Amino acid sequence: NFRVQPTESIVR
Amino acid sequence: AIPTNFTISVTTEILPVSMTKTSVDCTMYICGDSTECSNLLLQYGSFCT
Numbered sequence: 001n002f003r004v005q006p007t008e009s010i011v012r
Numbered sequence: 013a014i015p016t017n018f019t020i021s022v023t024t025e026i027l028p029v030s031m032t033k034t035s036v037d038c039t040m041y042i043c044g045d046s047t048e049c050s051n052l053l054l055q056y057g058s059f060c061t
Binding site for chain 2: 001003
C-alpha cells in the first residue's frame with residue numbers, strides 16, 4: 001500500500 | 013385415471029453465482045507504521061505470501 005514516511009516529530 | 017384438465021404454473025429459483033472479493037495485506041494487518049514489527053515479521057514472510 002501507499003505508505004507515507006513521517007517528516008517531523010511533535011511532542012505535546 | 014386419465015387427467016382431463018391441466019394448470020400451467022411457473023416457479024422461481026434463487027441460486028448464488030459468485031461472492032465479494034476481498035484482499036488482506038499481511039504487513040498492513042499485522043504491522044502498519046512500525047519498523048521493529050516489520051523486521052520481526054520478515055521471518056514470517058512465507059505465511060503472508
